[PDB]
Coordinates of C-alpha atoms in Angstrom, one line a residue:
Chain A
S557 CA 189.9 180.1 181.4
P558 CA 192.1 179.1 178.1
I559 CA 190.4 178.0 175.6
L560 CA 190.6 175.1 172.9
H561 CA 191.4 178.7 170.1
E562 CA 194.0 180.2 171.4
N563 CA 194.3 183.2 168.8
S564 CA 195.1 186.7 171.4
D565 CA 195.5 188.5 168.1
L566 CA 191.8 188.9 168.2
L567 CA 191.3 189.8 171.7
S568 CA 194.3 192.6 171.7
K569 CA 194.3 196.5 170.5
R570 CA 196.8 199.0 169.8
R571 CA 195.9 202.2 170.0
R572 CA 198.1 205.8 169.8
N573 CA 200.2 205.8 172.3
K574 CA 199.0 202.9 174.3
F575 CA 199.4 198.8 173.7
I576 CA 197.1 196.4 175.6
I577 CA 198.8 193.0 175.5
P578 CA 196.5 190.0 176.8
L579 CA 198.6 188.4 179.2
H580 CA 198.7 184.7 179.1
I595 CA 206.7 184.6 173.1
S596 CA 207.3 185.7 176.2
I597 CA 207.9 189.9 177.3
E598 CA 209.6 191.1 181.0
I599 CA 208.8 194.4 183.1
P600 CA 211.8 196.4 185.0
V601 CA 210.5 196.6 188.6
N602 CA 209.6 200.4 188.2
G603 CA 207.3 199.0 185.1
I604 CA 210.2 201.4 183.3
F605 CA 210.7 200.8 179.9
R606 CA 213.4 203.2 178.8
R607 CA 214.8 204.0 174.8
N608 CA 215.7 201.0 173.1
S609 CA 214.4 198.7 175.5
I610 CA 213.6 195.4 175.1
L611 CA 210.4 193.8 176.6
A612 CA 210.1 190.6 174.7
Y613 CA 211.9 187.7 173.9
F614 CA 211.1 185.2 171.4
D615 CA 213.9 182.5 170.9
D616 CA 212.2 180.2 168.1
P617 CA 213.1 176.4 168.9
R618 CA 213.0 176.4 164.8
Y619 CA 216.5 177.4 164.4
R620 CA 217.9 175.7 167.3
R621 CA 220.2 173.1 167.2
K622 CA 220.9 170.0 169.8
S623 CA 224.4 169.7 167.8
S624 CA 227.5 170.1 169.0
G625 CA 229.0 172.0 166.9
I626 CA 227.7 175.6 166.1
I627 CA 227.1 178.5 162.6
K628 CA 229.8 180.7 162.5
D661 CA 223.1 185.9 154.6
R662 CA 223.9 182.6 155.9
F663 CA 225.8 180.4 158.2
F664 CA 227.8 177.4 158.5
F665 CA 227.3 175.3 160.7
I666 CA 229.6 172.1 161.2
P667 CA 228.6 169.8 163.7
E668 CA 231.3 167.9 165.9
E669 CA 231.5 165.5 168.8
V670 CA 232.8 166.8 172.3
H671 CA 233.2 165.3 174.8
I672 CA 233.8 166.9 178.0
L673 CA 236.1 164.5 180.7
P674 CA 238.0 163.8 183.5
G675 CA 241.8 164.0 184.3
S676 CA 241.0 160.8 185.4
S677 CA 239.6 159.5 183.0
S678 CA 241.1 156.3 181.1
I679 CA 240.7 157.5 177.8
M680 CA 241.0 154.1 175.7
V681 CA 241.6 156.2 172.6
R682 CA 244.5 157.7 170.6
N683 CA 245.1 161.2 169.8
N684 CA 245.3 161.9 166.0
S685 CA 243.7 157.9 165.1
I686 CA 240.7 157.6 162.9
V687 CA 237.8 155.8 164.8
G688 CA 234.4 154.7 163.1
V689 CA 231.2 154.5 164.3
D690 CA 229.8 153.1 167.9
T691 CA 234.1 153.5 169.4
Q692 CA 233.7 152.9 172.6
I693 CA 236.4 155.8 173.7
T694 CA 235.4 155.4 177.9
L695 CA 234.8 152.6 179.6
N696 CA 230.7 153.1 179.0
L697 CA 231.5 156.3 176.5
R698 CA 230.8 155.3 172.7
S699 CA 231.6 156.9 169.9
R700 CA 228.6 158.0 167.8
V701 CA 230.2 159.6 164.6
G702 CA 233.1 158.6 162.6
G703 CA 236.1 160.5 162.2
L704 CA 238.8 161.5 163.5
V705 CA 239.8 162.0 167.8
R706 CA 241.5 164.6 168.8
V707 CA 242.1 164.5 172.6
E708 CA 243.2 168.0 174.6
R709 CA 244.9 167.5 178.5
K710 CA 244.6 170.8 179.8
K711 CA 244.9 171.4 183.4
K712 CA 241.6 169.5 185.2
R713 CA 239.2 168.4 182.0
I714 CA 240.3 166.4 179.1
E715 CA 238.7 167.0 176.0
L716 CA 238.2 164.6 174.0
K717 CA 237.1 165.8 170.3
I718 CA 235.5 164.2 167.0
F719 CA 235.5 165.4 163.7
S720 CA 233.4 163.7 162.1
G721 CA 234.4 163.3 157.6
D722 CA 235.7 162.1 155.1
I723 CA 239.6 161.5 154.7
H724 CA 241.4 162.6 151.7
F725 CA 244.8 162.5 150.5
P726 CA 245.5 165.7 148.7
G727 CA 247.6 165.9 145.8
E728 CA 251.1 168.0 145.0
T729 CA 249.2 170.2 143.4
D730 CA 246.7 170.8 146.3
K731 CA 248.0 173.8 147.5
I732 CA 245.3 173.8 149.7
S733 CA 245.4 176.5 153.4
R734 CA 247.1 174.4 155.4
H735 CA 245.6 176.6 158.6
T736 CA 243.3 178.1 156.9
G737 CA 239.4 175.9 156.0
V738 CA 237.6 176.7 153.0
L739 CA 233.9 176.0 152.9
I740 CA 233.0 175.1 149.3
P741 CA 229.2 175.6 148.3
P742 CA 227.2 172.8 145.4
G743 CA 229.0 173.2 142.8
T744 CA 226.8 173.6 139.0
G745 CA 227.6 170.2 137.5
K746 CA 227.4 170.2 134.3
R747 CA 224.1 167.8 132.7
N748 CA 226.5 166.4 130.3
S749 CA 228.1 164.0 132.6
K750 CA 226.2 161.1 133.4
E751 CA 228.1 159.7 136.2
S752 CA 228.8 162.8 138.2
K753 CA 227.3 163.0 141.1
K754 CA 226.0 166.3 141.6
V755 CA 226.5 167.4 145.5
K756 CA 223.9 169.5 146.7
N757 CA 225.5 170.3 150.1
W758 CA 227.9 172.1 151.0
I759 CA 231.3 171.0 152.3
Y760 CA 233.8 172.1 154.9
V761 CA 237.5 171.7 153.6
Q762 CA 240.0 171.2 157.1
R763 CA 243.0 170.6 156.6
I764 CA 244.3 167.8 159.0
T765 CA 248.8 168.2 160.2
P766 CA 249.1 165.4 162.8
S767 CA 251.8 164.9 161.1
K768 CA 255.2 167.7 159.2
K769 CA 255.7 165.8 156.3
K770 CA 252.3 164.3 155.6
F771 CA 248.8 166.3 155.8
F772 CA 245.8 165.5 155.4
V773 CA 241.9 166.9 154.5
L774 CA 239.2 166.1 155.9
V775 CA 235.5 167.0 154.8
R776 CA 233.4 167.8 157.5
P777 CA 229.9 168.9 156.8
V778 CA 228.0 171.0 157.3
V779 CA 223.9 173.5 158.5
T780 CA 222.5 176.4 156.9
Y781 CA 221.3 179.3 159.1
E782 CA 219.7 181.3 157.4
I783 CA 219.2 184.8 158.6
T784 CA 217.6 186.2 155.5
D785 CA 215.3 183.1 155.4
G786 CA 213.2 182.7 158.1
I787 CA 210.6 184.9 160.4
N788 CA 208.2 183.8 162.5
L789 CA 206.2 185.9 165.4
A790 CA 203.0 185.3 166.7
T791 CA 200.5 187.9 165.7
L792 CA 199.8 190.8 169.5
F793 CA 198.2 193.3 167.7
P794 CA 195.0 192.7 165.8
Chain B
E369 CA 180.0 233.0 191.3
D370 CA 182.9 232.8 188.4
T371 CA 185.6 229.9 188.0
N372 CA 185.9 230.5 183.8
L373 CA 188.0 233.2 183.3
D374 CA 187.4 232.2 179.3
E375 CA 184.0 233.0 180.5
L376 CA 184.6 236.1 182.0
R377 CA 186.5 238.2 178.3
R378 CA 183.1 237.1 177.1
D379 CA 181.1 239.4 178.6
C380 CA 183.5 242.1 179.6
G381 CA 184.8 242.0 175.9
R382 CA 188.8 241.6 176.8
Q383 CA 191.3 239.9 175.0
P384 CA 192.2 236.0 175.4
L385 CA 193.9 234.8 177.3
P386 CA 197.4 234.1 175.9
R387 CA 198.7 230.8 175.3
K388 CA 202.0 230.0 173.8
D389 CA 201.8 230.1 169.3
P390 CA 202.4 226.4 168.4
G391 CA 205.0 225.6 165.4
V392 CA 203.5 223.9 163.2
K393 CA 200.8 224.5 160.7
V394 CA 197.4 222.6 160.4
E395 CA 197.2 223.4 157.4
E396 CA 198.9 219.8 156.6
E397 CA 199.1 217.6 159.8
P398 CA 198.2 214.1 159.8
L399 CA 193.7 213.1 159.9
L400 CA 192.2 211.9 162.6
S401 CA 190.6 208.1 162.1
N402 CA 190.2 206.8 165.0
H403 CA 187.0 206.3 167.6
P404 CA 185.6 207.1 170.7
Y405 CA 182.8 204.3 170.9
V406 CA 185.5 202.0 169.6
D407 CA 187.0 201.9 173.3
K408 CA 182.8 200.7 174.6
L409 CA 183.4 198.1 171.9
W410 CA 186.6 196.9 172.0
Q411 CA 185.9 196.2 175.6
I412 CA 182.3 194.5 174.8
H413 CA 182.6 191.7 172.3
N414 CA 185.6 190.9 174.0
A415 CA 183.4 191.5 177.4
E416 CA 180.5 189.3 175.5
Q417 CA 182.6 186.3 174.2
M418 CA 184.1 185.9 177.1
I419 CA 181.6 185.3 179.7
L420 CA 180.3 183.1 176.3
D421 CA 182.9 181.1 176.4
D422 CA 183.1 180.8 179.3
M423 CA 179.6 178.8 179.4
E424 CA 180.7 177.3 176.1
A425 CA 184.1 175.7 177.3
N426 CA 182.4 174.8 180.1
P427 CA 179.3 171.6 179.6
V428 CA 178.6 171.9 183.6
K429 CA 179.0 176.8 183.2
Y430 CA 176.8 175.9 179.9
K431 CA 174.1 173.3 182.1
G432 CA 171.9 175.7 184.0
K433 CA 172.3 178.9 181.7
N434 CA 170.5 181.1 179.8
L435 CA 171.6 183.0 176.8
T436 CA 169.1 185.2 176.6
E437 CA 169.9 186.2 180.0
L438 CA 172.1 185.4 182.7
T439 CA 173.0 188.1 186.2
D440 CA 177.5 188.4 186.0
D441 CA 176.4 189.2 189.4
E442 CA 172.9 190.4 191.5
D443 CA 174.1 192.8 192.8
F444 CA 176.9 194.8 190.7
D445 CA 177.8 198.6 189.8
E446 CA 180.4 199.5 187.0
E447 CA 180.7 202.9 189.1
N448 CA 181.6 201.1 191.9
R449 CA 183.8 198.3 189.6
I450 CA 186.2 201.1 188.7
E451 CA 189.5 201.1 190.6
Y452 CA 193.2 201.1 190.5
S453 CA 195.2 197.8 192.6
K454 CA 199.0 197.4 193.2
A455 CA 198.4 194.1 195.9
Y456 CA 199.5 191.3 191.9
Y457 CA 202.8 190.8 192.8
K458 CA 203.0 187.9 190.5
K459 CA 205.5 190.0 187.1
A460 CA 205.7 193.1 189.3
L461 CA 203.8 195.1 191.7
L462 CA 201.3 198.2 189.3
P463 CA 198.0 199.2 189.1
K464 CA 195.3 196.7 188.3
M465 CA 191.7 198.0 186.5
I466 CA 189.1 196.7 187.3
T467 CA 186.0 197.6 184.8
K468 CA 182.1 196.5 185.0
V469 CA 180.3 195.0 182.2
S470 CA 176.2 195.7 182.7
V471 CA 175.5 191.8 182.4
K472 CA 171.5 193.6 180.9
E473 CA 174.6 195.4 178.5
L474 CA 175.9 191.7 177.1
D475 CA 174.2 190.5 173.9
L476 CA 174.9 187.3 175.1
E477 CA 172.3 184.8 173.1
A478 CA 173.6 186.5 169.6
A479 CA 177.1 186.0 170.8
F480 CA 176.0 182.3 171.9
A481 CA 174.2 181.9 168.1
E482 CA 177.5 182.8 166.4
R483 CA 179.5 181.7 168.5
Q484 CA 177.5 177.5 167.1
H485 CA 178.2 178.6 163.9
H486 CA 182.4 179.3 164.7
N487 CA 182.7 175.9 166.8
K488 CA 180.5 173.7 163.7
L489 CA 183.3 176.0 161.4
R490 CA 185.4 174.5 164.0
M491 CA 184.8 171.3 164.3
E492 CA 184.8 171.2 160.5
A493 CA 188.5 172.3 160.4
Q494 CA 189.1 169.8 163.4
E495 CA 188.3 166.6 160.6
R496 CA 190.4 168.8 158.4
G497 CA 192.9 168.6 161.3
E498 CA 194.4 172.0 160.8
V499 CA 194.2 175.0 163.8
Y500 CA 190.5 177.0 163.2
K501 CA 191.4 180.5 162.3
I502 CA 188.9 183.4 161.9
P503 CA 189.6 186.2 159.9
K504 CA 186.6 189.1 161.5
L505 CA 183.7 188.4 163.7
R506 CA 181.2 190.7 163.2
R507 CA 182.0 192.9 165.9
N508 CA 184.7 193.2 164.3
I509 CA 183.4 194.6 161.7
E510 CA 181.3 197.1 163.0
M511 CA 184.7 198.2 164.8
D512 CA 185.3 199.4 161.3
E513 CA 181.8 200.7 160.7
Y514 CA 181.7 202.9 163.5
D515 CA 184.8 203.8 162.9
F516 CA 184.4 204.5 159.2
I517 CA 182.4 207.9 159.7
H518 CA 185.5 209.5 161.3
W519 CA 187.5 209.6 158.4
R520 CA 184.8 211.7 156.7
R521 CA 184.6 214.2 159.5
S522 CA 188.3 214.8 159.1
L523 CA 187.7 214.6 155.7
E524 CA 185.0 217.2 155.2
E525 CA 186.5 219.4 157.6
Chain C
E579 CA 223.6 208.8 182.9
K580 CA 221.0 208.6 185.6
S581 CA 221.2 205.0 183.7
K582 CA 219.4 206.4 180.7
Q583 CA 220.8 204.3 178.4
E584 CA 223.2 202.4 181.9
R585 CA 220.3 201.0 183.2
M586 CA 218.6 199.7 179.7
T587 CA 221.9 198.0 178.7
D588 CA 221.1 196.2 182.1
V589 CA 218.4 194.9 181.2
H590 CA 219.4 194.6 177.8
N591 CA 222.4 192.2 179.2
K592 CA 220.2 190.2 180.9
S593 CA 218.4 189.1 178.0
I594 CA 220.4 188.7 175.6
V595 CA 223.8 188.0 177.2
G596 CA 226.6 187.4 174.1
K597 CA 227.0 190.6 172.7
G598 CA 225.6 189.2 168.8
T599 CA 225.8 191.3 166.0
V600 CA 222.0 191.7 164.9
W601 CA 221.1 188.8 162.7
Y602 CA 217.6 190.0 161.3
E603 CA 215.9 192.9 162.4
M604 CA 212.5 194.0 161.6
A605 CA 209.4 196.4 162.2
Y606 CA 205.9 194.4 163.6
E607 CA 204.1 195.9 160.8
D608 CA 207.2 194.9 157.6
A609 CA 206.9 191.8 159.4
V610 CA 203.0 190.9 159.4
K611 CA 203.8 192.4 155.6
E612 CA 206.0 189.6 155.2
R613 CA 203.8 186.8 156.8
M614 CA 200.6 188.2 154.6
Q615 CA 202.9 188.0 151.4
Chain D
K48 CA 203.6 236.2 125.5
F49 CA 200.3 234.0 127.0
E50 CA 197.2 234.3 124.2
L51 CA 195.2 236.9 123.8
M52 CA 193.0 235.0 122.0
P53 CA 190.3 236.5 119.8
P54 CA 186.9 236.1 120.8
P55 CA 186.2 233.0 119.8
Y56 CA 181.8 233.2 119.3
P57 CA 181.2 236.5 116.6
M58 CA 180.9 237.8 120.0
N59 CA 180.4 241.6 118.2
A60 CA 176.8 241.2 117.2
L61 CA 176.5 237.4 118.5
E62 CA 173.8 237.9 121.2
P63 CA 171.0 241.2 121.5
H64 CA 171.2 240.5 125.0
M65 CA 174.5 240.7 126.0
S66 CA 176.3 244.2 124.2
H67 CA 178.8 244.5 121.6
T68 CA 180.5 248.1 124.1
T69 CA 180.1 245.2 127.2
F70 CA 181.8 242.9 124.7
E71 CA 184.3 245.9 124.3
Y72 CA 184.6 247.1 127.1
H73 CA 185.7 242.9 129.4
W74 CA 187.4 242.1 126.0
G75 CA 189.1 244.3 124.8
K76 CA 190.3 246.6 127.9
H77 CA 190.0 243.8 130.8
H78 CA 191.8 241.4 128.9
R79 CA 193.9 243.8 127.3
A80 CA 195.6 245.6 130.9
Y81 CA 195.4 241.6 131.8
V82 CA 197.7 240.3 129.0
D83 CA 200.3 243.0 128.8
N84 CA 200.3 243.3 132.8
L85 CA 200.7 239.4 133.1
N86 CA 203.7 240.1 130.0
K87 CA 205.3 242.7 131.3
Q88 CA 205.4 240.6 135.0
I89 CA 206.5 237.3 133.3
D90 CA 209.6 239.5 131.5
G91 CA 212.3 237.9 132.3
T92 CA 210.5 234.7 134.6
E93 CA 212.0 231.9 134.8
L94 CA 207.9 230.5 135.3
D95 CA 207.2 232.4 131.7
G96 CA 206.8 229.5 129.3
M97 CA 205.2 227.9 131.6
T98 CA 201.4 227.1 131.1
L99 CA 198.6 229.7 132.2
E100 CA 197.9 226.7 134.3
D101 CA 201.3 225.9 136.0
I102 CA 201.4 229.6 136.0
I103 CA 198.7 230.3 138.0
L104 CA 198.8 227.0 140.5
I105 CA 202.9 228.5 140.9
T106 CA 201.6 231.4 142.3
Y107 CA 199.0 231.6 143.9
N108 CA 201.7 229.7 145.8
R109 CA 199.5 227.8 148.5
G110 CA 199.5 229.8 151.7
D111 CA 200.6 233.0 150.6
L112 CA 199.5 234.1 147.7
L113 CA 202.2 235.9 145.1
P114 CA 203.3 238.5 143.4
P115 CA 201.6 237.1 140.2
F116 CA 198.8 235.1 140.4
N117 CA 196.3 237.8 140.4
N118 CA 197.5 238.6 136.9
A119 CA 197.1 235.1 135.4
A120 CA 193.9 233.8 137.3
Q121 CA 192.0 236.6 135.7
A122 CA 193.2 235.9 132.2
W123 CA 192.6 232.2 132.6
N124 CA 189.5 232.6 134.2
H125 CA 187.8 235.3 131.6
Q126 CA 188.6 232.7 129.2
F127 CA 187.4 229.7 130.9
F128 CA 184.3 232.1 130.7
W129 CA 184.5 232.8 127.5
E130 CA 184.3 229.1 127.0
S131 CA 180.8 228.5 128.9
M132 CA 179.2 230.9 126.6
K133 CA 177.4 229.9 123.7
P134 CA 175.6 232.1 120.6
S135 CA 171.9 231.4 121.6
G136 CA 171.9 227.6 122.9
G137 CA 170.6 226.6 126.0
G138 CA 168.4 224.9 128.2
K139 CA 167.8 220.9 129.5
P140 CA 171.5 219.5 128.8
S141 CA 171.5 215.9 128.3
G142 CA 173.6 212.9 128.1
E143 CA 175.9 212.4 131.2
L144 CA 174.8 215.4 132.8
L145 CA 171.4 214.5 133.0
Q146 CA 172.4 211.5 134.7
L147 CA 174.7 213.2 137.3
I148 CA 172.1 215.8 137.8
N149 CA 169.2 213.5 139.3
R150 CA 172.7 212.1 141.3
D151 CA 173.1 215.2 143.1
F152 CA 170.5 218.2 142.5
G153 CA 167.8 215.2 142.0
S154 CA 166.7 217.2 139.4
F155 CA 167.9 219.6 135.9
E156 CA 165.0 222.4 137.5
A157 CA 166.9 221.9 141.2
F158 CA 170.1 221.9 140.5
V159 CA 169.1 225.3 138.4
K160 CA 167.7 226.8 142.2
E161 CA 170.6 226.3 143.3
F162 CA 172.5 227.8 141.7
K163 CA 170.7 230.8 140.8
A164 CA 171.3 231.0 145.1
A165 CA 174.8 232.3 143.8
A166 CA 173.3 235.8 143.1
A167 CA 173.8 236.3 146.6
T168 CA 176.3 234.6 147.5
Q169 CA 179.5 236.7 146.4
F170 CA 178.7 239.9 147.9
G171 CA 181.3 241.5 146.1
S172 CA 183.4 240.6 143.2
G173 CA 183.5 236.8 142.3
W174 CA 183.3 234.0 140.3
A175 CA 180.9 231.1 141.0
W176 CA 181.5 227.5 139.5
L177 CA 180.5 224.0 138.5
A178 CA 183.2 221.8 139.5
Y179 CA 183.9 217.8 139.5
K180 CA 185.2 215.6 142.6
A181 CA 188.3 214.2 141.4
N182 CA 191.0 216.3 144.8
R183 CA 194.2 214.9 145.4
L184 CA 194.3 214.2 149.7
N185 CA 197.5 215.6 150.0
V186 CA 198.8 214.6 153.8
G187 CA 198.2 212.0 156.7
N188 CA 196.2 208.9 156.2
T189 CA 195.1 210.5 152.7
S190 CA 194.3 207.3 150.7
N191 CA 190.3 206.1 151.5
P192 CA 189.8 202.7 153.6
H193 CA 186.3 200.7 151.6
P194 CA 186.6 203.4 147.9
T195 CA 184.2 203.5 146.5
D196 CA 181.9 205.0 143.6
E197 CA 179.9 207.7 144.3
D198 CA 183.2 209.3 145.2
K199 CA 182.6 211.8 142.3
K200 CA 180.8 215.1 143.2
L201 CA 179.5 217.5 141.0
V202 CA 180.0 220.4 142.7
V203 CA 179.0 224.3 143.1
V204 CA 181.4 226.6 144.5
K205 CA 182.2 230.1 145.3
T206 CA 185.1 232.6 144.5
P207 CA 186.1 235.3 145.6
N208 CA 188.0 237.3 143.2
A209 CA 191.0 235.7 141.6
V210 CA 189.8 231.7 143.1
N211 CA 189.9 229.0 140.7
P212 CA 189.0 225.3 141.9
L213 CA 192.6 224.1 140.7
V214 CA 194.0 225.7 144.0
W215 CA 192.5 223.3 145.4
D216 CA 192.0 220.8 142.8
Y217 CA 187.9 220.4 142.2
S218 CA 187.6 219.8 138.2
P219 CA 185.8 223.3 137.0
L220 CA 183.2 223.0 134.0
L221 CA 181.7 226.5 134.3
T222 CA 182.0 229.7 135.6
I223 CA 180.0 233.4 135.4
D224 CA 181.8 236.2 136.2
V225 CA 179.6 238.4 138.5
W226 CA 182.8 240.7 139.0
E227 CA 180.3 244.2 137.8
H228 CA 182.1 245.4 135.5
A229 CA 180.5 242.6 133.3
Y230 CA 176.7 242.7 133.8
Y231 CA 176.9 246.5 135.1
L232 CA 175.7 248.2 131.5
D233 CA 173.4 246.0 130.5
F234 CA 171.3 246.2 133.6
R235 CA 172.4 248.5 136.6
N236 CA 172.9 245.6 139.3
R237 CA 170.3 243.9 138.6
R238 CA 172.1 240.8 139.2
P239 CA 168.7 238.3 139.7
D240 CA 168.1 239.0 136.5
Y241 CA 171.0 238.8 134.7
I242 CA 171.9 235.6 136.0
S243 CA 168.2 233.6 135.0
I244 CA 168.7 235.0 131.4
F245 CA 172.3 233.6 131.8
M246 CA 171.3 230.5 132.5
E247 CA 168.5 229.7 129.9
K248 CA 169.2 231.6 127.1
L249 CA 173.1 231.7 126.3
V250 CA 175.2 228.7 127.5
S251 CA 176.8 225.6 125.4
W252 CA 175.4 223.7 127.8
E253 CA 177.5 221.1 125.6
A254 CA 180.8 222.8 126.3
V255 CA 180.4 222.0 130.0
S256 CA 179.6 218.0 128.6
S257 CA 182.4 218.5 126.6
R258 CA 184.8 219.3 129.9
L259 CA 183.0 216.9 131.3
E260 CA 184.2 213.8 129.7
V261 CA 187.4 215.0 129.8
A262 CA 187.1 215.5 133.8
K263 CA 186.6 212.1 133.3
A264 CA 188.7 211.1 131.8
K265 CA 191.8 213.5 134.0
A266 CA 189.8 211.0 136.6
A267 CA 190.4 208.0 134.9
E268 CA 194.4 208.7 134.0
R269 CA 195.3 209.5 137.6
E270 CA 193.7 205.9 139.0
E271 CA 195.7 204.7 136.0
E272 CA 199.0 206.4 137.3
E273 CA 198.2 204.9 141.5
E274 CA 197.5 201.6 139.1
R275 CA 201.6 202.4 138.0
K276 CA 202.5 203.3 141.2
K277 CA 201.1 200.6 143.1
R278 CA 202.3 198.3 140.3
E279 CA 206.0 199.9 140.9
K280 CA 205.2 199.2 144.8
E281 CA 205.3 195.7 143.4
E282 CA 207.8 195.6 142.3

C-alpha cells in the first residue's frame, strides 16, 4: 500500500515519446484513452489561491470582499435600503451582519438580494471631482518620511462613489485583496 | 528457403533494394543520450524498493522476513507474467501489462540496509519537523552511470 | 472537423467551464527551474 | 595579397640533408603558383581581406568544398609546415609536452614510433598532423554532463590532399608534407627513411611547445567566453 514518505517523482521516469506517471493534482482520460493536440489531462486547482469571501478578484488582481445575503421574497428584512448598519446588525430573524457598511437591498422577482458593502464612509469636498459611476482603486502611496504623523497606508483601497440621493453623494473606501498572476507557481514534481 | 531479400542481394551481386530518400542530413542531428539497460533498472530500483518497503512499512510484514532471501512466489515465471489486461475500469477500460520481477533478481538485503540509514535520516527529519526529502539514491546515481557511457558513444562516432 | 478539436474542446470545457483568460502559462521544465531557483 | 613569406630559416644553405634545389622547387615554385592563383581567384572577392584561416574555413564550405579552399589550405599548410622545421634542433622535447606524452602515448618514444606509422597511412598526397582537442560540439546534446579534465587529448590524424584540422576544429600543432614533391628528390620514394630523419634531425620541438601554449591559451579563452555566456544567461 502507501507509505509515509510519498514522493511520486522518485517513482516516475520520462522517456522519449513516453511519459509514465504512477497513479496514487488529478488527471482524467477520455473514454477512448485518446488524447489530442492541446488536450488537458491534468487539473491543478490550488486551494492556496482560493478565497472564502464572496468578493472575487477582477499582473495583479484586486479582490473587494462584500457581504451578500440571498434571501427569499417572503423573508422579512430588518434593515432598510441604503442604510448604514454596524457590526452584528440583525438583518433577519436569524441572520446577523458580519461586517459593517452600507446595506443595499435588491428586490428581484422571486429573490431578495441584500448586499453589505463594508468600508469607511467619507464625504468628498467640492474640489473632489471623483468619477461617480467609475470606481477607482488607489495603490499604496509612497508617503514622505519627513511627516511623522503621516500614517502610511500599506494596503490598497478601493474607492467607490455611492449616490443614494440625486443631490447628496458619498465615497466608500472598500477593502482590497492581492491576487498576482506572475507571483505564485506551485506544482508537484511529476517526472524525476 | 530464403526469407531475407537483403541476404539474397549479397550472394547474387545485385544492387540494394531501394528505400525512399530521407530529407534530413545526419551531418547535423541531435545526439542520442538514453540507455537500453536503463529500462531494467528503473523497473528494478523501484522493484527492489517496493518489496523492501512492504516489509519496512509493516511490522507484521517485517516479522518472519529475511532480507537476504525472499520469494515473491513459489512458481512465478517472468515470461508467464507478461500480459495485457483491459478488465479494470476504475478510471477507464484499457490494457494493463504485468511484469514479474524475479525475487532472486532483486537485491533486497542491500536495499534494506540502505533503507535503515534512510529511515534514520527520516527520523532526524521528523525531529526537525521538516518532511524528509532525498534527492538521489545510489540506484538513481547508477542510472546516470550506465547512461553515461552512451554519451561518449555518440560522441565518439 | 471530426471532432479533431471539437472533442478535445468538449473535454476542455469540462475541465474549464468558464472561458477564462489564461493568467499563467508555463512549461514543466520552466516550472522546475523556477522551483530550483 | 596574402603573405608570400620569405622562408623563416636560412633555408638554402640551412641543412645538408635537405637540398637547396629541393627547397627552391618546394617554396620557390609551389608557393609562387599557389599565391598568384590564390590572388588571382581572390580578385574582386568579398572574401578577400579575411585571414587565411578565415578564407580556408570559408571555402571549405562545410559539406561542399567550394572553389577556393584548395589553394588556401595548401598555402597555409605549407607555411605551418614550415614552422615545424628547425635549423638542426630536435629530440626529447620536454615541458608541458613530456607530461602530456606519458599521459597519452606513454613515452616520447612511443609517440615517435606511433608517428612513424603515418608513412603508411597516406597512400598519396597529404599531410600528417599532431593536434589539440579544443573541439566545439555543434549540435543537439552538445554539452557534456559530468564535465571533467583529461577531456583534452593530443591527437594524431591523417589528412588527404588539402585538409587542415581547423576544418574540424582540432588545434594543429605539427605537420609533414607527404606529397611526393617534398621528399622525392632527396630519396626516391624512400618515405620510411625520410620520415625518421625529419622526426629526429630537424623538427623545432620548441616551436611545437610554443604552439601548445598558444592552444592552451585559446582553450582558456573559449572557456572564459563560455563563462561569459553563462553569466549572460543568468542575468
